[PDB]
Design a protein around this ligand. Structure first.
Ligand code: HEM
Length: 377
């Protein structure tokens, strides 16, 4: 394997080499004139210390509205400004909408008949539709909006195409923001402007939309796909999605902890010299935290390496830690819970279409996941 240790998985787990590295050690990513050195933190307490001490570890190093690029006090102000579109009450209001979105996708899969690819019908479609509903993109515009969203970032396209889709995407978003300023709706944009008005600038809001579209897509499709695969491999646990809501929420939390789809959060930069876990960190050093390794730290529980949806909950760092803790965490838990509950309500006998087949993992994104999952029912 020529890939960095923090990118390695073995099935649903961290790779053994990644798990056996030190709590904090040096690594070099890349070669020749590209090669760089970083510290990699794999221990739960070290990742919490690094991520939680923003006075000591900065996330900077332009993109307006990208919260991850700022440090307090600038971060604090921007995050406060976007928070109205993510309150727990706004999430409760979204639930009916997310249930309809999931059922519409399940309907298409049902119509296609067994066996069918759960990744193409559900995992890769729900995330985007849910974000469109959150942002406030009108139904009939979603398909078009999503091609612009993905398109303006497709490295495979020429400068001329990417640029054209990008100019089209900004124009769509800016037009949406101006519409919302006039008559604020319940979407994210409308919630922010209703509270801040002109203080939330056009560029801030446009940038917020781009970043949210990015932050809540890959992590969720990876969790939908790896989550169904994990449950089908532990069938006695599926009942956690066939009971009350508490039961399902606890199963979703355990799956997020067990699978930790993001390999690492934004790299942290030491803003000064310090000693951490016995190592001497110097002003300017870069630190990469392995969230998957941290959520498999042995001190967390004697059976931390197993999936147990009924265990005593283990606080995890899959949504990060500190001021940058996932702003979309509540929506993510709700979305995943809705997907898994409606899935097993509709397909009680869901199973792998071919139990012998090798698993097709998605190894090219910032989040682990599946590229295809054939299921039958
Ligand atoms: C299973 C799903 C998800 C996982 C595991 C997850 C994970 C993360 C992590 C680890 C961070 C912290 C990054 C850092 O400290 O550098 C974070 C940040 C963030 N996430 Fe999520 N996320 C998920 C879903 C979502 C969704 C559904 C939304 C969008 C509606 C969202 C929006 C964001 C935003 C805006 C930030 C930046 C917060 C800030 O910098 O203050 N995430 N997420």
């Amino acid at each position: 394997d020529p890939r960095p240790l923090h990118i390695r998985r073995q099935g649903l787990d961290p790779a053994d080499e990644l798990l056996a590295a030190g709590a904090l050690t040096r690594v070099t990513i890349g070669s020749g004139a590209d090669a760089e050195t970083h510290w990699m933190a794999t221990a739960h307490a070290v990742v919490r210390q690094v991520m939680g001490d923003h006075q000591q570890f900065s996330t900077r190093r332009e993109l307006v509205g990208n919260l991850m690029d700022y440090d307090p006090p600038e971060h604090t102000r921007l995050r406060r400004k976007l928070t109205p579109g993510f309150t727990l009450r706004k999430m409760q209001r979204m639930a009916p909408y997310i249930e309809q979105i999931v059922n519409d996708r399940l309907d298409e899969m049902e119509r296609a008949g067994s066996p069918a690819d759960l990744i193409a019908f559900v995992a890769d479609k729900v995330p985007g539709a849910v974000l469109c509903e959150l942002v406030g993109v009108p139904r009939d515009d979603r398909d078009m909006f999503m091609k612009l969203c993905h398109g303006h970032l497709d490295a495979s396209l020429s400068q001329k195409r990417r640029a054209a889709l990008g100019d089209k995407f900004s124009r769509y978003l800016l037009a949406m923001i101006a519409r919302e300023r006039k008559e604020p709706g319940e979407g994210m944009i409308g919630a922010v402007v209703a509270e801040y008005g002109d203080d939330a600038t056009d560029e801030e809001l446009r940038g917020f939309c781009v970043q949210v579209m990015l932050a809540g897509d890959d992590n969720i499709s990876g969790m939908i796909g790896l989550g169904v695969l994990a449950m089908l491999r532990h069938p006695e646990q599926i009942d956690a999605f066939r009971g009350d809501e508490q039961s399902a929420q606890r199963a979703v939390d355990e799956l997020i902890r067990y699978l930790t789809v993001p390999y690492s959060p934004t790299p942290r930069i030491a803003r000064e010299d310090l000693t951490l876990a016995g190592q001497e960190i110097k002003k300017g050093d870069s630190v990469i935290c392995s969230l998957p390794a941290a959520n498999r730290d042995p001190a967390l529980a004697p059976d931390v390496d197993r999936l147990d949806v009924t265990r005593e909950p283990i606080p995890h760092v899959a949504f990060g830690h500190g001021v940058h803790h996932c702003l979309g965490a509540a929506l993510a838990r709700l979305e995943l819970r809705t997907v898994f509950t409606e899935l097993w309500r509709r397909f009680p006998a869901l199973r792998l279409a071919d139990p012998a087949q090798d698993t097709e993992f998605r190894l090219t994104t910032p989040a682990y996941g599946l590229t295809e999952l054939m299921v039958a029912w």
